Design a binder for these strands. Structure first.
Lengths: 372, 372
RNA sequence: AAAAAA
């Protein structure tokens, strides 16, 4: 390879992904990428995440990571001296944005005033800056797919964007079906949680369920949960009582609001491409797996995570806030390494003197009934 | 002044305070301090905080802040060139630890290989490094007083380290007074929160509980809070019932546990100096004020904040964690700019798979009854 | 924006 791109590895991989995307999409040539990293970064497999985010073919783009001490300026300059000794590259492109402060300093001092060399720096929101040999700025924004963004964190994911009802239905399902049957739906919630119904769904056989051909198992129950009442609430939502799938029970007990939020984003949110929105998401990294209601990556490459809670009954305000804070910080941040925008959507009305009103002070955006 | 110290200003002031303290205590000479800052840091008054942390006399140490663009290498080198044009300093001492990457880079390139100049860098936990003209490391640890640490964040504070009972008493007060009288103490908690008692202590320094009319105890409307019960619990704790101060009621309702924690630190914790421990702290910054149970700055200059909750009865798990998370993140961090180690101390037993057990995943260290 | 685009 006659062109080499040098990047410094730090905790945030997206800037390096964007710089490499920017250069390749402009030049479209075979090249080598040199990642300058450290022990700490390599323990977190950051070089692998950057490579996977780009998904080049190894026949066209060669990758190599070399290792330095993040606080040792002489060691970084020495390993760069060794690497480039007797080199034959025609173009050396250096991005000093990442790494430690000392790594950036050593890289700049090594590459400054060198022939066939260009040095760049990317402040977060500002333009990409060429520092050498010409001082000038370039508009740099490469849009990432949601898959690229999550691969950049080493995160695999599954999702289910197939909705029980379409957007026209979900736009009005609250006023026409949910609002007047809250007590019937409470009975269906207890039915979903009963171990007979929960276990009778075998997951491959017993994929559908005839509610007619079924005795008074509805007996182990919550009051509203009577056989005919469950038949009624299923017909209110337009379901075939002779073939009730578990996804249909989930819809009634709260899935409708998840679909509503997902479909509202795909149909109305303008800073979001629908191909970067996902519903009923399971994320996995190593042996950690977790579920997210709705996520989307906006056109600014910022990841949004939404907790959909159709109703919050006021006495559980502290528990709902705790669960939300736990999902964002302990799980998404500490175990997955994701820095996201957090949202809580609810059809309930959030009063100012409730614990849930504190969510905004934790950085959680709340959209309550007065906005939905 | 023949000696000038150059420091770069960023969000965290303690490293600059430590470096300036380190050099002055070693040289003990008049000097000038040059702070290289930005609009963003000076909007936060960071230069003022650093100066107040050092509390030099202006007759001996001169301060000046100059302003640069945090992402502009040419502007930083230009303003340093202008500042030092025709200078006659005998010693130029540069600490490039703070600021942005670009500020550190520009400063290093300007000062490297300059006469009568020494350049230093302070990696986080690591030793202080001289980068130029000699590569060598120095043992650096300057201990800060608690007042210095808080002045470094622009925080004024008041505290009350005078305990109602001594450590010998508080070591055994749980077994001998609290454990067997919990229901009487619930009555005193309701008494402290009653508006009669709360308001009469604003007009009086002490009450005589024998002369108080029974109808004011019945106005509390707590079953345990009867005149005779409150007289008894006060005598159990050894107080003069004819002269009850509000601090005595506070002791019974949970202050005993704050004193126990505070005194346990001063008597048993060895990585902390007793002069850097404070009890019942009120912190103030601008128009924001809040109260902290116990705080201490350890001998590694790290600030610890303890929430003392004598008892959490399991039903209050979500609220207590929410309250603690709110005090740590929304208040202490976001409004006061403090990066602390958070602890929650309780005499209760925190079972696993309870909401309080999640605190460790938020970074909150819990010491429950099995440790106290 | 000591401690890893910010």
């Amino acid at each position: 390879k006659e062109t080499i791109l040098v990047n410094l590895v730090s905790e945030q991989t997206i800037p390096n992904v964007q710089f490499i995307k920017w250069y390749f999409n402009k030049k479209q040539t075979p090249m080598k990428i040199l990642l300058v990293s450290t022990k700490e970064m390599e323990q977190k497999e950051k070089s692998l995440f950057i490579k996977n985010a780009l998904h080049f073919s190894d026949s066209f783009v060669e990758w190599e990571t070399i290792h330095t001490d993040g606080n040792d300026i002489s060691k970084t300059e020495n390993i760069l001296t060794d690497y480039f000794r007797d080199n034959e590259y025609k173009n050396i492109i250096v991005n000093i944005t990442g790494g430690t402060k000392i790594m950036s300093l050593a890289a700049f001092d090594f590459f400054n005033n060198k022939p066939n060399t260009e040095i760049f720096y990317q402040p977060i929101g500002k333009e990409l800056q060429e520092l050498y040999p010409n001082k000038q700025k370039y508009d740099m924004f490469e849009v990432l797919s949601l898959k690229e963004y999550l691969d950049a964190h080493g995160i695999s994911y599954k999702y289910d964007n197939e909705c029980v009802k379409d957007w026209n239905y979900n736009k009005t399902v609250y006023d026409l079906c949910v609002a007047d049957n809250r007590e019937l739906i409470k009975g269906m919630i207890a039915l979903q949680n009963n171990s007979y119904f929960n276990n009778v769904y075998k997951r491959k056989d017993f994929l559908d369920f005839t509610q007619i051909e079924e005795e008074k198992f509805i007996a182990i129950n919550h009051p509203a949960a009577t056989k005919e009442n469950m038949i009624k609430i299923l017909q209110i939502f337009g379901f075939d009582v002779s073939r009730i799938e578990h996804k249909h029970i989930r819809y009634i007990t709260g899935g409708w609001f998840e679909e509503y939020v997902y479909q509202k984003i795909c149909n109305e949110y303008h800073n979001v491409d629908e191909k970067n929105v996902a519903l009923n998401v399971t994320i996995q990294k190593g042996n950690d797996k977790n579920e997210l209601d709705v996520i989307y990556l906006d056109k600014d490459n910022k990841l949004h995570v939404i907790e959909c809670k159709s109703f919050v009954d006021g006495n559980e305000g502290n528990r709902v806030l705790n669960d939300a804070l736990y999902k964002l910080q302990a799980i998404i941040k500490s175990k997955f390494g994701l820095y996201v925008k957090q949202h809580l959507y609810t059809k309930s009305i959030i009063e100012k003197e409730t614990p849930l009103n504190r969510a905004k002070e934790f950085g959680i955006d709340i959209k309550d009934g007065t906005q939905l």
